[PDB]
């Protein structure tokens, strides 16, 4: 099946899931000066203050905290959102090396990693039927730095030893992603699509501007990750990013001047 390596990767994903080639794909470029600051986007609202994570697992792509979204504890409301998106879980995209990892890029600039935390539509119910819907999801992507740690990240690295492998999971409660934040809100939103398989459109993009600074070490420990199951020869999980894809038919908008 689909992954990020020479057989298996990108370029590949087109012959299992054709939109690989539609015509709101992400990642994208994020070109600064061709980006059109939007009045008309209201402040972006992010109340996690209440979320309730329950469990952290390597899926052979990434590895992924998820959260209890069955009531409206943790939600993103604001910017370019009409109503109320819910907090489901989070995961990174990160390199080999530091020059590389993130999947949206600034002007070109790869960062070191990018974070997603994803969140689905309430008005679909469900993060199954939201994802058959154009306006169904909201994923805010952050990027990673390295420099000093992120000290609200470290939970986080110290667990990552015990789902080493892929479908090793373990229970993860009482984790802030806001620990995870940079302090500026300022953003770029397009409309876009997941960027793994099944790659659907589905998703309003919100970008920050803002990086967040992690520390080599605590980057280290995300490529010390594996690819395979338990047993199998070591494949590091790195490099699983997609690149940049056309930007076709969008406009690229800033909350910012
Ligand atoms: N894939 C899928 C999927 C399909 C249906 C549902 C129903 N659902 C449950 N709560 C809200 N919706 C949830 C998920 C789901 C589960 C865990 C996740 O991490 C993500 Cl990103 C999505
Ligand atoms: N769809 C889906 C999905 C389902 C489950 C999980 C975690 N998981 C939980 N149990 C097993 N795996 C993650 C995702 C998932 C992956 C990439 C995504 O795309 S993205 N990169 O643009 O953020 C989005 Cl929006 C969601
Ligand atoms: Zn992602």
Same mark, same amino acid.
């Given at each position: 099946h689909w992954g990020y390596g020479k057989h298996n990767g990108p370029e590949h994903w087109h012959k299992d899931?054709?939109?690989?080639?539609?015509e709101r794909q992400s990642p994208v470029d994020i070109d600064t000066h061709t980006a059109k600051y939007d009045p008309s986007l209201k402040p972006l609202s992010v109340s996690y203050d209440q979320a309730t994570s329950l469990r952290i697992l390597n899926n052979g792509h990434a590895f992924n905290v998820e959260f209890d979204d069955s009531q409206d504890k943790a939600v993103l409301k604001g910017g370019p959102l009409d109503g109320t998106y819910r907090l489901i879980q989070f995961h990174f995209h990160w390199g080999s090396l530091d020059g590389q990892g993130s999947e949206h890029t600034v002007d070109k600039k790869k960062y070191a990693a990018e974070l997603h935390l994803v969140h689905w539509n309430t008005k679909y119910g469900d993060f199954g039927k939201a994802?058959?819907?154009?306006?169904?999801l909201a994923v805010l992507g952050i990027f990673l730095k390295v420099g000093s740690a992120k000290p609200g990240l470290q939970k986080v690295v110290d667990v990552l030893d015990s789902i080493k492998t892929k479908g090793k999971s373990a229970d993860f409660t009482?984790?802030? &992603?806001?620990? #995870?934040?940079?302090?500026?809100?300022?953003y770029w939103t397009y409309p876009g699509s997941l960027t793994? &398989?099944?790659? #659907?459109?589905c998703v309003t993009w919100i970008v920050l501007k803002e990086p967040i600074s992690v520390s080599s070490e605590q980057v280290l420990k995300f490529r010390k990750?594996?690819?395979?199951?338990?047993?199998?020869?070591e494949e590091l999980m790195v490099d699983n990013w997609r690149p940049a894809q056309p930007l076709k038919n969008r406009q690229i908008k800033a909350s910012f001047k």
């Open positions: 899931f054709p939109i690989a080639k539609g994802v058959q819907q154009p306006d169904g009482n984790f802030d &992603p806001r620990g #995870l934040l940079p302090e500026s809100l300022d793994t &398989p099944p790659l #659907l459109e990750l594996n690819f395979n199951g338990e047993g199998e020869p």
